[PDB]
Amino acid sequence: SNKIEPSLHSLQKFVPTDYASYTQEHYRFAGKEIVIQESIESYGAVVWPGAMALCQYLEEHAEELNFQDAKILEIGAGPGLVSIVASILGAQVTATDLPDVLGNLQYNLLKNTLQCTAHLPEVKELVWGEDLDKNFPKSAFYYDYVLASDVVYHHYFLDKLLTTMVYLSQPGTVLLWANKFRFSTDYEFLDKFKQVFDTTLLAEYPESSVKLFKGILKW
Amino acid sequence: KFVPTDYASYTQEHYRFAGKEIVIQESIESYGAVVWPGAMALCQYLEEHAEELNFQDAKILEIGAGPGLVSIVASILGAQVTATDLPDVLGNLQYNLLKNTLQCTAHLPEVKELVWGEDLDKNFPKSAFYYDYVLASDVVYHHYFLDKLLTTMVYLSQPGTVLLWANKFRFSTDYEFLDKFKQVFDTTLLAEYPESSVKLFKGILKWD
Amino acid sequence: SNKIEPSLHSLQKFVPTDYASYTQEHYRFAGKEIVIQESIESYGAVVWPGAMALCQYLEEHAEELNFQDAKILEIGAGPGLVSIVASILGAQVTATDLPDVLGNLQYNLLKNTLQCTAHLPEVKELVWGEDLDKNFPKSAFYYDYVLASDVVYHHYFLDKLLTTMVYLSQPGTVLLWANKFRFSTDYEFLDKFKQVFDTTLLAEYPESSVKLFKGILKW
Amino acid sequence: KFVPTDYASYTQEHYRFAGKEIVIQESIESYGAVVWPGAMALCQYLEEHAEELNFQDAKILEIGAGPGLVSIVASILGAQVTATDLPDVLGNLQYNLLKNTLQCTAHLPEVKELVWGEDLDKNFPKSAFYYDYVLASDVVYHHYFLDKLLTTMVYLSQPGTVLLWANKFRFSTDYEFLDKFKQVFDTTLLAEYPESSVKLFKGILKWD
Ligand SMILES: Nc1ncnc2c1ncn2[C@@H]1O[C@H](CSCC[C@H](N)C(=O)O)[C@@H](O)[C@H]1O
Ligand SMILES: Nc1ncnc2c1ncn2[C@@H]1O[C@H](CSCC[C@H](N)C(=O)O)[C@@H](O)[C@H]1O
Ligand SMILES: Nc1ncnc2c1ncn2[C@@H]1O[C@H](CSCC[C@H](N)C(=O)O)[C@@H](O)[C@H]1O
Ligand SMILES: Nc1ncnc2c1ncn2[C@@H]1O[C@H](CSCC[C@H](N)C(=O)O)[C@@H](O)[C@H]1O
């Protein structure tokens, strides 16, 4: 092969990124300046408001959440801001999404965490409702925390989303889900979520119509 | 003319729609020589809704027709069908379309080149080409012609034209395309199959 | 695999591009607006003055050069502007460079030629002086034209460069080489080039200290 | 402490420099557990130029020392050597360095963590760490620490310090690094091996 940054090899195994359209966007969380490649004006991944909210919550509740060495999975990670912040806070982070997102997700993770966080993040395809037992078998993959931000949108496969949330929530797992409430379907999803998860409203961000929920699975 | 691309990997695949047993020559070496999940769902819809749609004698254009199953089904149902794709796809498209429609549908279907967003005014002038329906299946995926695709869909959508678009949803970009489609078309979800991640939409061009 | 633009699969097989540093630069040659990803301020490939000069020559001498269906190889192609222009003019273009250049080279070629030129360009590693018989055997790879722009720079392996130029110049092959004359080593290389190639000065670009040479191999 | 990374793929590789037969434990699973072409060329240079360089009792730091061949050779030649790398590389680096220098060179070499550009003021204060030579081999390649690398080279280059840097040239970025190195160091090409694409430079920090 070529003598390159070894992390770049995993990047080469994802769908390529249409980078002409992507620009460097700057954030600051958990004491660090963060740079995210996003495609704001054309096709490609972007940071959503739910991410901004969840990142604020994580930086502010870091001591309580005890992310140091926690095993974390993010569903619908997008460009990766939340997974980056979780990694800065010391978690073992697996960031997941659809195949066209994974390259830029991995790139963003590398650019913000390589040799400067406790654990190198992992990037993996996870299509909601598909191949869960095959790729994320409960018996081999317990997560202390499952993160999700702005994964509820009317055109997504939302029962597959709920099924995935449930699948990844074992006894002890804490699910942190932030969303902007844009449409009636979002409200309807919250009612479905509350039926199966013991649900707590942790924070409200009225300025962005974002709410942050904790879900632990009812026994 | 059109001659099929000379693949050594052609297979004869067997389908049944609108009451006819249909054979489609396919090759995995080209997306356009493969029947995709959107095609199956759209064929099932056309077969089940033929009465409502009044395809009898309707003028229809299919974009990205690939191996031609949807165009065959539309011809079987009595439409005047124009099947379009990239120049290299046309040979096998015409072969399949003719094998399945010659002397057995109401109207012989036509095959024409239509590269998305290229020379639409010159190749398909509105002064002479009006479609009652535009059909599209599995044309949205992670490729570099998404804007040109939407432009083409808009172009072919004169007032009165109905667009029927089926697609498997695979990529973040597919959802972005859907959002852009809804900005320009009054959109109705006709059917959804979460197991196969397929949606089928009607689009009517917005004027307001 | 994934249902993606099929050209993107070849892109995934090259060293990844550090795209945060790359910006879209605009050129106009051979009647077309061209967009090139370049890394001007940091590590990554850029367009050199020799490219600008050679592109001007190609657009202006298109009829004479008869690039339609010509088999062309570019050595040290960089971000790919020259190979793009050659492809627009109708040539079968093989663009070559060191492994860290090939991804962005291929990307630039795709963004400017996919479904809009006569022949899809090829991208291949070609390290000067290495693996020539193995990867570009004269008996299977005859080129009508070999292109090179600003490939002469003092810190490169310039005898390996000359050896490569010679290797790729069969009877009938026309070598078009543009360079800015920056250093004494550049002048010295020109003297070496003239010793082995029948050399003609085709054009001088005094405004950028660029000269464009034709070389045909002495028999 | 430092313990070698637990690879199942360690091999015992055999070198001869400065008159000693040297054994280096290597693993292809880490760049830092492999001897690279720059190392060989730099060792050959140090062996051939030892008289001129007055390494006897010289204080020397190696950055990116990897499996430690260059540091071993420098110790053999009588220098006080500090070998540095990433924390995961240090175990095998110390193992090799000790196996080859314990009770048989003038000065026992030291192994210390030095992640390029990280906490240099805190970990290697100038108030207490002056190197007569800084050594580096094959530390330039297509990685995301090139600026930090150069910063580190500059940091360790106090007035009087000589930097010796050997490298295989593989990538366009390697040449860009060389251009940036020459902006900040008065640079001399000590040796060049086109067949193996290796160059060896001396750098002295510029003040003018
Ligand atoms: N069925 C599915 N499987 C996996 N991911 C999906 C999905 N449907 C949508 N997604 C992903 O969910 C994300 C929603 S957008 C939110 C992105 C990110 N969490 C942020 O807040 O910035 C997108 O990245 C999208 O690709
Ligand atoms: N830029 C472009 N212009 C015209 N057709 C294109 C195109 N890009 C892709 N296509 C065509 O779109 C099709 C996508 S695959 C879908 C084929 C068929 N509709 C089915 O569902 O089975 C291929 O036939 C491909 O050749
Ligand atoms: N030994 C070698 N083998 C292959 N390419 C080399 C090389 N040494 C340098 N190069 C390449 O030669 C190019 C010189 S810069 C010129 C780039 C381009 N032709 C333009 O004019 O814009 C770089 O892309 C560099 O990576
Ligand atoms: N950011 C960083 N800080 C410190 N060392 C680094 C580094 N990035 C890479 N390295 C080290 O640089 C070395 C490059 S390989 C060269 C090893 C040795 N000098 C030889 O020539 O054989 C590896 O040991 C690697 O661990």
Curated annotation (Swiss-Prot), chains B, D:
Keywords: Cytoplasm, Methyltransferase, Nucleus, S-adenosyl-L-methionine, Transferase. It is an enzyme of class 2 (transferase). Coiled coil: none annotated. The keyword DNA repair does not apply. Its EC number is 2.1.1.-. Signal peptide: none annotated. It catalyses: L-lysyl-[protein] + S-adenosyl-L-methionine = N(6)-methyl-L-lysyl-[protein] + S-adenosyl-L-homocysteine + H(+); N(6)-methyl-L-lysyl-[protein] + S-adenosyl-L-methionine = N(6),N(6)-dimethyl-L-lysyl-[protein] + S-adenosyl-L-homocysteine + H(+); N(6),N(6)-dimethyl-L-lysyl-[protein] + S-adenosyl-L-methionine = N(6),N(6),N(6)-trimethyl-L-lysyl-[protein] + S-adenosyl-L-homocysteine + H(+). S-adenosyl-L-methionine binds at W36, G64, A65, G66, D85, W116, S137. Its main location: nucleus. One of its GO terms (molecular function) is protein-lysine N-methyltransferase activity. Changing Y141A: Abolishes methyltransferase activity. GO terms for cellular component: cytoplasm; nucleus; protein-containing complex. One of its GO terms (biological process) is hormone-mediated apoptotic signaling pathway. It is found in: Nucleus; Cytoplasm. Protein-lysine N-methyltransferase using S-adenosyl-L-methionine as methyl donor. Mono-di and trimethylates 'Lys-943' of AARS1. Belongs to the methyltransferase superfamily. METTL21 family. Interacts with members of the heat shock protein 70 families; these proteins may possibly be methylation substrates for the enzyme. This is Protein-lysine methyltransferase METTL21C. It comes from Homo sapiens (Human).
